Amino acid sequence: QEANTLVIDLEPPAAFADDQPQGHNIDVTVAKLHNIDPEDHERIRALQRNGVPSTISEEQPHTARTDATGTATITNLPPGTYVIRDTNTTKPRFSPLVIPLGIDTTSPTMTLRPKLIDATPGAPNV
């Protein structure tokens, strides 16, 4: 039973001198997405900037918190794609992002550091 760990970093990583690990002032919404292979990078990046609409089939939602450094840590995520948006509209740090996970029966760990460019409001938009 391999543990499933998902790490999302939108800024240069450095969990040492820097306080990157610290930062729970931002709330994030997690919404599983219909199982999609990670190979379709165009598909992911397309939704990384555009975001995932509610029209897409999503599993039970999960909650978590992220730091102001664009970093976040979430576990217990079975294979498939994930939806992450900044709930804290007070100080939004990131826009809706999509991260795929090795589609399979087994649940592997995935560590990624997505690099997105400001795509106008969205999460805090509504």
From TrEMBL:
GO BP field: carbohydrate metabolic process
Entry keyword Transmembrane: yes
UniProt KW keywords: Membrane, Signal, Transmembrane, Transmembrane helix
Top-level taxon in the UniProt lineage: Bacteria
Keyword Iron-sulfur: no
Protein name stated in the entry: Surface anchored protein
